[PDB]
Amino acid sequence: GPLGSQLCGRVFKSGETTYSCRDCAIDPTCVLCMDCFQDSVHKNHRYKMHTSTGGGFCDCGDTEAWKTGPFCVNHEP
């Protein structure tokens, strides 16, 4: 419902591509799904793509994961 979809929360499946902003990630485990990455400032930053082995989740919206621009435009309040 609306509460479960207010933030991204995408859970990755094996074979999907994750994105991390190397400039803004607090640590290497901070990741974004493709849509949030492409809808965020980090599309313009130094980034790393990493194919998921399944599991993990998108960190769009977590101030404690990103030094700047924690929300993509879609999820930004």
Q: Which stretch binds Zn ion (CB under 5 A): 12-20, 29-37, 49-57?
A: 29-37
Interaction between residue 65 and Zn ion (CB under 5 A): no
In this chain, which of 12, 18, 42, 70 binds Zn ion, going by CB under 5 A?
42
Interaction between residue 60 and Zn ion (CB under 5 A): yes
Backbone CA torsion sign across 74, 68, 47, 3: negative
Strands (E), the chain: 17-21, 47-51
Distance between CA atoms of residues 28 and 34, nearest Å: 16
Count of residues of this chain found to bind Zn ion when the rule CB under 5 A is applied: 13
Tokens of 74: 């879609």
- Of the pair 45, 52, the CB lying nearest Zn ion is at 45
